[PDB]
Amino acid sequence: SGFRKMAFPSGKVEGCMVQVTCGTTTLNGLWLDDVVYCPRHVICTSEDMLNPNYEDLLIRKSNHNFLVQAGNVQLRVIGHSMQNCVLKLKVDTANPKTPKYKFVRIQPGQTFSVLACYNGSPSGVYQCAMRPNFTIKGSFLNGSCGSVGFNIDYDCVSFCYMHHMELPTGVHAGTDLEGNFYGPFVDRQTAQAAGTDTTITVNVLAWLYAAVINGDRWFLNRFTTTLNDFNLVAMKYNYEPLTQDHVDILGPLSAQTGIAVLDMCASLKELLQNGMNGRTILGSALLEDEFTPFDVVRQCS
């Protein structure tokens, strides 16, 4: 029993992290087979970042402009190319620790584990949700670009995030491993901002189920509601609309608890309106929205 935010074990990813240096810029790369993946802004100087022409900046670079360090071992770069906002450096040595892996783009609302790294060296692990506004609430300092996010399914690492930048509110933005940004962000030092954060309704509901399953039952009531009335409340509180697909995904937990989703929604309605009346749910004084239904089922049944 118990309920905690928990990351996937990071060992399979630790063994892929390397240090990539281009000129004066050093950040992290991901070494899979004989290719190292990293943010393309590694090729940029400060003045470049102000308005980069990445095509031209890359054309004027050669293999010899890149230094890749796997621990103490230097990896010789023998090719380079760009895919979207990711730089691909072909190296002379296949990573003998390459896990079984896929590149997958994740959907907003879903979670993944971040291995925060500095200078090619793993420093910590934590779980993040891809938020509706396509940012993540990470913990990153300078030198962390190229840190990756991932999920593990059996033996297969699904890489879904590479870290590129910090936004003014302190939240974080990046790309998938094919170099496509999550959200309307660009890899240039220009005015950029997180849009309005909206709350992930299905995850809040999931977490209330987790609370019930862990003996926190005080928010429950005899009442139920409809999708339409609830969604009018959700809109007022900058919650995402709840869909029938969401209701269906929560089905296991409705059954497990005997609390139907729209019954739980009446609970959530009061909490949004009347508040939490001084209590806590699962040790929080806020409504938590970064636990998916899956995340919750893994620990509550």
Does 124 participate in binding a second copy (rule CB under 8 A)? yes
Does 180 participate in binding a second copy (rule CB under 8 A)? no
Nearest to 244 by CA among 220, 227, 224, 257: 227
Does 4 participate in binding Cl ion (rule CB under 5 A)? no
Residue 284 beta carbon to a second copy: minimum distance, rounded to whole angstroms? 7
How many Å apart are CA 6 and CA 173, to the nearest integer? 21
Encoded one letter per residue, x for contact with a second copy by CB under 8 A and - for no contact, window 190-229 reads ------------------------xx--------------
Q: Which of residues 256-285 bind a second copy (CB under 8 A)?
A: 280, 283-285
How many Å apart are CA 288 and CA 204, to the nearest integer? 6
Please give the angle made by the CA atoms of 188, 193 and 199, to the nearest 5 degrees.
135
Nearer to a second copy (CB atom), residue 90 or residue 137: 137
- Applying CB under 8 A, the span of 12-20, 176-184, 187-195, 199-207 interacting with a second copy comes to 12-20
Q: Give how many residues touch a second copy by CB under 8 A.
A: 40
- Partners of 148 in beta bridges: 115, 162
- Applying CB under 5 A, the span of 87-95, 101-109, 213-221, 271-279 interacting with Cl ion comes to 101-109
Look at residue 182 and give the partner it binds from a second copy, Cl ion, none, a contact being a CB closer than 5 to 8 Å depending on partner kind.
Answer: none
Residues whose CB is less than 8 angstroms from the CB of residue 71 and which lie 6 or more positions away in sequence, other chains included: 120
- Applying CB under 5 A, the span of 56-64, 114-122, 182-190, 280-288 interacting with Cl ion comes to 280-288
What φ, ψ does residue 122 adopt, rounded to 5°? -60, 135
How many Å apart are CA 276 and CA 123, to the nearest integer? 36
The number of CA neighbours under 13 Å toward the Cβ of 110 is 15
Does 238 participate in binding a second copy (rule CB under 8 A)? no
Three-state SS at 151: strand
Q: Site residues (CB under 5 A) for Cl ion?
A: 106-107, 110, 284-286
